[PDB]
Amino acid sequence: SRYTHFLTQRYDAKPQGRDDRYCESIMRRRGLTSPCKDINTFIHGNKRSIKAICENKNGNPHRENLRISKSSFQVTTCKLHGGSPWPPCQYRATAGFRNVVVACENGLPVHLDQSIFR
């Protein structure tokens, strides 16, 4: 439930571009444009690795009740451009590659900490 919603909001397995136009498309596809979300980051790659963050084989405890990954992931950060509060929402894409901070419930990721992505 919260896991499927995490994936919806935060996981794109195999993107192609990761350019501005990619962000604008996926923010709409995934229902993050009512209202226009200020910033959102998607994790790429394989799903079992992200699940693994909630175990000891890919995660460490972090701050208050979070977990931070041992391995790095391809990520894309979509940053709202030009103050649109409601659609059409315009976005600027920054691709990166780093470890990720999540929260886990019942051994599955359910929240992504945006703050590590500026």
Numbering used by the authors: 4 to 121
What does the paper say about this structure?
Angiogenin (ANG), a 14-kDa basic protein is an angiogenic ribonuclease and member of the bovine pancreatic ribonuclease (RNase A) family (also known as RNase 5). Like RNase A, ANG cleaves preferentially on the 3′ side of pyrimidines and follows a transphosphorylation/hydrolysis mechanism. In addition, the crystal structure of human ANG has revealed that it has an RNase A fold and the catalytic triad (residues H13, K40 and H114) is conserved. The enzymatic activity of ANG is several orders of magnitude lower than that of RNase A towards conventional RNase substrates, but essential for its angiogenic effect.
ANG residues H13, K40 and H114 (part of the P1 sub-site) correspond to the catalytic triad. In the crystal structure of H13R ANG PD variant, the substitution of H13 by Arg is very clear in the electron density map and the overall structure is largely the same as with native ANG. In the native structure, Nδ1 of H13 forms a hydrogen bond with the main-chain O of T44 and Nε2 makes a water-mediated interaction with the amide nitrogen atom of L115. In the variant, the Arg side chain stretches out into the active site pocket making a direct interaction with Q117 while retaining its interactions with residues T44 and L115. The interaction with Q117 (known to be the obstructive pyrimidine-binding site residue in ANG)642 seem to result with slight rearrangement of the C-terminal helix. In addition, in the variant, the Arg side chain is not optimally positioned to interact with the two other catalytically important residues K40 and H114. This provides a structural explanation for the dramatic loss of RNase activity observed in this variant.
